[PDB]
Amino acid sequence: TLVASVLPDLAYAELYSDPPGLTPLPEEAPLIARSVAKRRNEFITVRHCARIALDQLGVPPAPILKGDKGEPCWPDGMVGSLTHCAGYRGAVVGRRDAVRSVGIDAEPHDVLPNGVLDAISLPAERADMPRTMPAALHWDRILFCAKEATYKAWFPLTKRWLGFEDAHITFETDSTGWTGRFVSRILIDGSTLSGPPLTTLRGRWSVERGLVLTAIVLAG
Template sequence: MESLLGAAPVTVVETREDPADPFLFPEEADVVARAVDKRRREFATVRQCARTALAELGVPAVPILPGPKGAPRWPDGIVGSMTHCAGYRAAVVARASAVTSIGIDAEPAAPLSDAGVLALVTDESERAALAGLGFRHPDVPWDRLLFSAKESVYKTWFPLTGRWLGFEDARVHLHPDGTFTADLLVPGPTVAGRELTGFRGNWLIRDGIAVTAIVLPLTPPAPGT
């Protein structure tokens, strides 16, 4: 993730291991009190990543609790995103004075195991594009990358709107150069005086992990630029 976002005004902390006794504030521990051990460790480790990243910005350690829709509630003046999958946890944060919103996602770098999931998260044009990409670059799990990109889109969208965004509400275009774009198919929020119509992001596959990320600048580019 750090190499993916190296030029962005953000702080990244990532890890591939859970500490033996990860710290949680009591309020956080209550959230996962009935969860299985795997879930508790993911929850705790990714928050440790987030607190380490916040400390680099000079922000003291605080509980990072999920909001009503599950999105993390960051300290005032901070935007960020967290992700975890098997063997990987990461958090990216920034000051709201530097970045409008952030969305990151990590997935195993393997094709989706259930064809029904692909039908659920894509439309016909996206599936046609995936077929073409798969023909030209068969070594890349494009369906998994598209799923991950839509997760990053949602994580970027939600802090701006507080509203759900379905898989069918954004059309993702993956590019072999490690970038992607997402066109919103529903009215977007107003950012810097302009209606947001989509997002631009980056993707990377390394050491068996596929990651996608969006950092929305304070002034998003105009549509078509």
Template sequence: MKSLLPPHVAVSEAFEDLPDVALLTGEAEALARAVKKRRREYATVRHCARRALAELGLPPAAILSGANREPIWPEGVLGSLTHCDGYRAAALAHVGTIASLGIDAEPHEPLPPGVLDTIARPEEYPLLDRCASEQPGIHWDRLLFSAKESVYKAWFPLARRWLGFEDATVHFDSRGGTFAVEIHESGPVCGERPLSEMNGRWLVRDGLIRTAITVPAA
């Protein structure tokens, strides 16, 4: 994930859940009814976040969740979390170095039947077909899903409202590891312009898809 983000973004990853990770005040209470698997996943990704905080020169802090399950960061910090089977990651930056960021990881597997039709816009099908002809070893449907997850994670802290899969069109560079995003919702003003586009990077390696978006500071 580090290779997909600017140098000033702190990134911490884990490829398995870590035993005996201590939860801080408020985090344990949030998991009072969670099953063991969920507790370990939650604890590990927050351990990653605290390692990233340390890389930024900041003390440990509880990472609670807001009403839309978004992470609530300490003052002066922005970031994004992701987790899937076999992978946990956190990416954090000081406020002001960038406007927002979003990361996502997925298993490098096809989407379940029927899911692509719920996330893809009509114009994206020929784009995916073209990418598949150029790079047939990649599950482009799952990569599209991951890219749109990163879009939402970068969008929400700025807009503070929902952005659906149907509200963004993703254009992949099949060989360059980048993608461009057109946003079809009225966006917040960022850098004196409405946020109508984003740019991201993607990587497929070791059975995982990783995507990341950085919104530059104004």
């Protein structure tokens, strides 16, 4: 799988298309009743992936509903993250006793649309990241993906907004050239609903098959 290359009580599942036959669980069906086909397909497929991952940890097939801000609602004692983009649906789930939080993101490995890099990056990131990343890789898109995994790991623990300017992310590249590590440093107050405050979040990135994947797994 693609997500295994960005991961270190934890399970995952991913699909690259929307298989025929899959349906939402009855409890999930109202959430996409008036949604277009592209949205229903990604919603149904990513939650099938979530249930495949949850099954590996011994959780019965459960619906994945949404919270007030759209965040996924996991079964008791579980945490996880979902992502879907063109050609990718992915889920990573963990047991809360050992895994405090998970955040993952996937995006096509393409240059960012005009003007978006400046809206999602800090000046030091634009200056330093091209020097730590392999030539010709879309480091701007990889930066955006790391910001998204950071927010997805952050929000279940804080229930607070995190802006793109509120996290400074530094990168390293493995010897292979297409995978590496990152560290996201939270610049604002990192107080959480329970447990110690969030300061630095360590994650991994990977470019493979036209996709960028990022994941953060915070140990309990």
